[PDB]
Structure formats: structure tokens, C-alpha cells
Design a protein around this ligand. Structure first.
Ligand SMILES: [Ca+2]
Ligand SMILES: [Ca+2]
Ligand SMILES: [Ca+2]
Ligand SMILES: [Ca+2]
Ligand SMILES: [Ca+2]
Length: 322
């Protein structure tokens, strides 16, 4: 079973699923004038991504059309994006999200940071393969052309998916690395950024947790305070994201959802990416952390800043109140 499915998702396989039944219902809802969005919503948000792909294969066969194109020609705005995101294979969606983050004059460093720090090593290998297949350029090369300095080096390190996959924790290595981090930053003039990058990007999460514990004992401070006093810019943000994900990935993503839902305006691109990409992995834990940290559920948060068909689809993905 797939590397894209976790133990705490809000979207699961539908036992009574029938691809020909669903494809026929979707074709009816989008064909002719008017669209039955409640129908598209009731089906697609109640099928896992694996089943949706079966709907996709069954729709191209029977109607000679790609469901993605039917959805895009009929739907609009944020609802359209969210609906198209649901029927995209997970590796392909992250690849498209990575490419979107580096297009035009701007560059969305925050999205780059979010994706490269939360995907496991096996997921990154998949994303790199899909990116290469769909864009015919390596992910490393595009990352390289849109970034510079230490941030660039750390992103390229992450894009390779070589973070240690072992399940072992070595007390001895943790103490040694804590000492190297201290010498690389606090203990010298300047900083050996390469060392920060090498340890924080290649040791396993459980190993790093131990390392941060040892770091605190040696330095009398948290690794976060050293990163803040030693580094700056996007490189600093990247390293803090790694530390936050090492301690609690769902809380980091909950914070990202929180920031996308308030302020100057709603960040629908981030909301869509997190809701869809974590729906079959850990959205349930994201919901728990969101409520623990903010005092209100993700569900009520979505209800207060979104509306219409877009709001219903996100509430259905959310799967419940906390
Ligand atoms: Ca129509
Ligand atoms: Ca760009
Ligand atoms: Ca220093
Ligand atoms: Ca330096
Ligand atoms: Ca700083």
C-alpha cells in the first residue's frame, strides 16, 4: 500500500464505490447548460484519490474526454482549482504545486519550504520523477534557477530525498551532531551554514529530535534560538520549518492553515494545497493541533472565511468538527 496514504487522513476509500456509476453521474452533472455542483461535490469528496483515478480512467473510456478538462471547462474560480486538485495524482499535484511556486517574476518561497520540508524521502523521489516526466526539466534545475545562496543549497539537498530513512536513534551520533551544530554557529564568528544544512536535512526526524535535546543541554538554549541568532532570510525560515516539522508536522501545517485563513485576505492556494495534499495522510492530526493551538476548530475556521461551493468542498474534506 501506497506511500501517499497515512494513518490519520479524513478521506478514506468508499466501500460501495463503483467507477462506472460515478463516471456516469459526473458526466450527467456537467453536460448541457448548468452544472450540478452538489453532485460533483458529493461524489469526488467522498472517494479517496485512488478511487478518483479509477473514475478518471472510466470517464476517458466511456466519454472520450479527460475528466480534468470537463471540470475545467465547466467550473470556475477557487472551486474549479480545488476540484481539479482532487482528481490529480498526489505526486503530480505536488509537482504542479512546486512548479506553480516558481513561475513568473515572483517566487513563493513559503510554498517551496512547506512542501520540501513536509514530504518524506520516498514522496520526494516520486515528486522528482513526476516533475521530470511532466515538465521535462529536473526539479533541482528549476529550484536552482529561482533561488540563490544557502537557501538554494538546502532546497537542492531536500529535493534529492536523501534524508536518512532508518528507524534507529543513536544517542552517540545525537551528542556528536549537537556539538558540531554548536561549533558551527554559536561557538564561532560567522556560521558554517553548510553544516546546519547537512545535519538538519539528512538526519532522520527521530534522530534530530534527540539532537535538539542534546543541543539544548550543551548550549543552554534551544536550536531555534541559535538558528534565529545565526541565520536570516529564507534560509533561516527553511531551517525553522525543519525544526518545527521534526517536533510536530501537523502543528506546523495547522499554523500554515491558520495564516492562510486570516489577515489581508484568504490564501486559497495554500488552503487548497494543505487540505487536498494532507487529506489522506494527517489532516485529522492537523485538525487536532489547530484546535489545541487556536481554541476553535478548523471546520469553524473554514466556515467563517470561505463561502459557496468552495466552502462546502473544504468542509467535506475537513470531514467534521472538533
Ligand atoms: Ca455544463
Ligand atoms: Ca519564477
Ligand atoms: Ca556564530
Ligand atoms: Ca559563512
Ligand atoms: Ca534572524
Amino acid at each position: 500500500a501506497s506511500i501517499w496514504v497515512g494513518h490519520r487522513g479524513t478521506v478514506r476509500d468508499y466501500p460501495d464505490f463503483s467507477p462506472s456509476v460515478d463516471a456516469e453521474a459526473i458526466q450527467k452533472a456537467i453536460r448541457g447548460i448548468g452544472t450540478d455542483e452538489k453532485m460533483l461535490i458529493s461524489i469526488l469528496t467522498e472517494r479517496s484519490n485512488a478511487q478518483r483515478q479509477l473514475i478518471v480512467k472510466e470517464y476517458q473510456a466511456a466519454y472520450g474526454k479527460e475528466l480534468k478538462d470537463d471540470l475545467k471547462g465547466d467550473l470556475s474560480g477557487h472551486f474549479e482549482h480545488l476540484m481539479v486538485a482532487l482528481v490529480t495524482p498526489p505526486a503530480v499535484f505536488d509537482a504542479k504545486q512546486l512548479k506553480k511556486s516558481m513561475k513568473g517574476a515572483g517566487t513563493n518561497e513559503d510554498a517551496l519550504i512547506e512542501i520540501l520540508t513536509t514530504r518524506t524521502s520516498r514522496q520526494m523521489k516520486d515528486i522528482s520523477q513526476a516533475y521530470y516526466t511532466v515538465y521535462k526539466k529536473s526539479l533541482g534545475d528549476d529550484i536552482s534557477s529561482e533561488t540563490s545562496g544557502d537557501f538554494r543549497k538546502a532546497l537542492l539537498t531536500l529535493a534529492d530525498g536523501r534524508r536518512d530513512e532508518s528507524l534507529k536513534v543513536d544517542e552517540h551520533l545525537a551528542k556528536q551532531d549537537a556539538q558540531i551544530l554548536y561549533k558551527a554557529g554559536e561557538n564561532r564568528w560567522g556560521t558554517d551554514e553548510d553544516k546546519f544544512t547537512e545535519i538538519l536535512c539528512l538526519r532522520s526526524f527521530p534522530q534530530l529530535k534527540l539532537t535538539f535535546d542534546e543541543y539544548r543541554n550543551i548550549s543552554q538554549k534551544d536550536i531555534v534560538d541559535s538558528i534565529k541568532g545565526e541565520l536570516s532570510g529564507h534560509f533561516e525560515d527553511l531551517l525553522l520549518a525543519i525544526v518545527n516539522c521534526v517536533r510536530n508536522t501537523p502543528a506546523f501545517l495547522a499554523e500554515r492553515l491558520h495564516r492562510a485563513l486570516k489577515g489581508i485576505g484568504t490564501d486559497e492556494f495554500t488552503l487548497n494545497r494543505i487540505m487536498v495534499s494532507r487529506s489522506e495522510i494527517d489532516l485529522l492530526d492537523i485538525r487536532t493541533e489547530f484546535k489545541k493551538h487556536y481554541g476553535y476548530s478548523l471546520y469553524s475556521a473554514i466556515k467563517s472565511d470561505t463561502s459557496g461551493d468552495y466552502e462546502i468542498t473544504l468542509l467535506k474534506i475537513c470531514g467534521g468538527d472538533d
